[PDB]
Amino acid sequence: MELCSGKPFDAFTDLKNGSLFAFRGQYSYELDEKAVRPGYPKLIRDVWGIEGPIDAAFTRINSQGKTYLFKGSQYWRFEDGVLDPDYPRNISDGFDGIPDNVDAALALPERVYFFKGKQYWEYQFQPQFISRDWHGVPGQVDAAMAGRISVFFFSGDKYYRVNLRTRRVDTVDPPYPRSIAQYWLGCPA
Ligand SMILES: [Ca+2]
Ligand SMILES: [Cl-]
Ligand code: NA
């Protein structure tokens, strides 16, 4: 399936050195201005060595910049695009109190947020309600990604941008939620 199909996404890694990966079904999409063929559909099995679909992803913004991919009760940890030793692991082994089958995740430089249903968990290296703490985000999300000053929440074929300081949905034209394909990916539409 092509990047600009208009279909919902499953997961996004966090922005690292200006690039990230998008996941949908069995496919991995590399989004980087410096890439020769940005957004070519590659198999997750080829790039990451695991079967899609994946539930959630995040990337730490420390020196090592490890990427974490979640599916079911399992997670995989990558550095330099290679699976670390002793992965995959049960989520319970690395992430005390975080549930299985998460909807989304994002990392901030150090906290990770995990999203599932109407709730989210904070993990540092009880659940709270998404809507109470992420003002204007209506509840359940499919995917999430953190940048520098904003996080992005993906719901179906649309998304929200949330300011990290205010934890509020930004006021843009046309307003959030809006098309991922048209306004986030810059897809010809
Ligand atoms: Ca997901
Ligand atoms: Cl995600
Ligand atoms: Na993510």
From Swiss-Prot:
What is the annotated tissue distribution of the protein whose record heads this document?
A: Expressed in the retina pigment epithelium (at protein level). Expressed in plasma (at protein level). Expressed in serum (at protein level).
Hemopexin repeats sit at 6-50, 51-98, 150-187
Glycosylated sites: N17, N90
Protein's GO biological process: cell adhesion; cell adhesion mediated by integrin; cell migration; cell-matrix adhesion; endodermal cell differentiation; extracellular matrix organization; immune response; integrin-mediated signaling pathway
**One annotated GO molecular function:** collagen binding
Q: How does it assemble?
A: Exists in two forms: a single chain 75 kDa form (V75) and a clipped form composed of two chains (65 kDa and 10 kDa) (V65+V10) which are held together by a disulfide bond. Interacts with SERPINE1/PAI1, insulin and C1QBP. (Microbial infection) Interacts (via hemopexin repeat 2) with P.falciparum (isolate CDC / Honduras) SERA5 P47 (via C-terminus); may form heterotetramers of two VTN and SERA5 P47 heterodimers; the interaction may protect merozoites from phagocytosis by host monocytes; VTN glycosylation appears to be dispensable for the interaction.
**Name of protein:** Vitronectin
Q: Which organism is it from?
A: Homo sapiens
Q: What is the lineage of its organism?
A: Eukaryota, Metazoa, Chordata, Craniata, Vertebrata
Covered residues, full protein? 154 to 474 of 478
